[PDB]
Design a protein around this ligand. Structure first.
Ligand SMILES: *[C@@H]1O[C@H](CO)[C@@H](O)[C@H](O)[C@H]1NC(C)=O
Lengths: 262, 194
């Protein structure tokens, strides 16, 4: 079942021998390949100089994954939502690769205990301020790691002391704290996000049984406002928690409104 | 030397709330042009192809009315700059007409050895009888540029005759007609190699 170069356990894939290959491990009965890949809790690539990119397709089979390590290899970038289907993934080691940048949104569904980003060729930018922030608040063990980024003039700055102006977490407001509505009537809530860069904003409210419409009120610079309208409200949505989120490249904030219907 | 011309002009899309809509544009000329679509959001993803001379605007999950709009693809090189438009309409689940495309069977996870045949499955219904097209990794699959290796089946499936490393990816079928457009949930094709 195991691909060559690697040593495959029942719950472990280790590919530490040097390798010119650029294809993520694929064990090899479409029902069986899924079953075998579930039981894997730990993948460890190392010294794969030509492994440049990591797709979501590569990861999606390994649903039981808890530990991913792609160390000291050629890794340039990770496709968005790569780790979507790897919910148990908590230890990630991406040190020693060719990463110039990295998005927090890769890890938005995960509860990372340890994210290792040491010795990558990071370039200073707003795109990586989130790392600086995680580092400050002691998130995912970045606080212990010594991380630098590089300015265009080749200056190497410690990440703690990165200074990018107009590059902050978004702030978020909502028109109502809680919401009371009579069954059959309509209702309007407005959520706005503000900051730099200008955050996207969304009412993550799909599980709602009622009919609902979303409309952008403003997109002036620095404020983004969206207006959730609930039409002909069913009482099946009593006690539902309407949540709005505002994200930019720095991070994410949210607000919650309790909906009560009678 | 030659200014930019559009060989793929994007077409209007009537999508359904919660689902997906794609717009495709692609330009050509000398020098090679760079195309581009016109707030930064996970729901709006631009996928580039052909060294940036083509680009697909993928919008998902669709929200209404907010996403409804005219969108602009702009091809540009040293000799010119040209623009094409396309509209997005987004119907709610309750607002869908009776004959709005519906995916009755979507594609499924498939693994296949290199050089073997692999057929990704799709079956759709609606009125008019919907026309089916495929999308591999958010870009549209073009059976004519194979050539003869990849075949669009009558029933709607996609037949890939000689499996290749490049054929691996996330496939999804798209049923569409005058009433609108509906995406299947996605399915991955893996290609084992030795
Ligand atoms: C994986 O582990 C489960 C545990 O119940 C077992 O039933 C199954 O046979 C195993 N499959 C493989 C591929 O080892």
């Amino acid at each position: 079942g195991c691909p060559a170069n690697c040593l495959c356990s029942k719950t472990d894939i280790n590919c530490k021998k040097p390798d010119d290959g650029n294809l993520f491990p694929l064990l090899e009965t479409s029902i069986q390949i899924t079953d075998i890949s579930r039981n894997i809790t730990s993948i460890h690539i190392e010294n794969w100089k030509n492994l440049q990119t990591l797709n979501a397709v590569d990861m999606e089979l390994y649903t039981g994954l808890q530990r991913l390590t792609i160390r000291n290899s050629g890794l340039r970038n990770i496709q968005p939502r790569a780790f979507a289907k790897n919910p148990h993934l908590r230890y990630i080691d991406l040190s020693g690769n060719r990463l110039t940048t990295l998005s927090w949104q890769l890890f938005q569904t995960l509860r990372l205990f340890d994210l290792r980003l040491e010795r990558n060729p990071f370039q200073c930018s707003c795109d990586i301020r989130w790392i600086q922030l995680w580092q400050e608040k002691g998130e995912a063990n970045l606080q212990s790691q010594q991380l630098h980024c590089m300015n265009l003039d080749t200056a190497v700055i410690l990440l703690r002391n990165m200074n990018i102006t107009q590059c902050d977490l978004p702030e978020i407001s909502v028109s109502h704290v809680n919401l009371t509505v009579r069954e059959g009537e309509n209702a309007v809530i407005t959520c706005q996000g503000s900051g730099s860069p200008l955050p996207d904003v969304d009412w993550t409210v799909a599980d709602l049984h009622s009919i609902n419409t979303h409309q952008t009120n403003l997109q002036w610079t620095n404020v983004h406002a969206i207006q959730l309208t609930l039409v002909n409200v069913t009482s099946e949505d009593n006690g539902f928690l309407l949540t709005c989120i505002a994200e930019n490249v720095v991070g994410m904030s949210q607000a919650s409104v309790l909906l009560t219907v009678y | 030397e030659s200014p930019p011309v559009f060989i793929k002009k994007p077409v209007d899309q009537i999508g359904v709330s919660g689902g997906v809509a794609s717009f495709v544009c692609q330009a050509t000329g000398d020098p090679k042009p760079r195309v581009t679509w016109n707030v930064n959001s996970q729901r709006f993803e631009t996928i580039e192809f052909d060294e940036s001379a083509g680009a697909v605007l993928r919008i998902q999950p669709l929200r209404t009315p907010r996403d409804e709009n005219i969108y602009e693809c702009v091809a540009q090189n040293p000799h010119g700059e040209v623009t094409v438009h396309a509209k997005l309409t987004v119907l709610r689940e309750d607002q869908l007409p009776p004959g709005f495309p519906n995916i009755d069977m979507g594609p499924q996870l498939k693994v296949v050895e290199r050089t073997r045949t692999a057929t990704m499955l799709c079956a759709a219904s609606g009125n008019p009888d919907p026309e089916i097209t495929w999308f591999k990794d958010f870009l549209p699959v073009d059976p004519s540029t194979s050539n003869g290796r990849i075949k669009q089946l009558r029933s709607g499936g996609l037949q890939i005759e000689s499996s290749e490393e490049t054929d691996q990816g996330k496939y999804e079928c798209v049923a569409s007609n005058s009433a609108g457009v509906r995406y299947s949930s996605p399915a991955n094709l893996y290609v084992r190699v030795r």
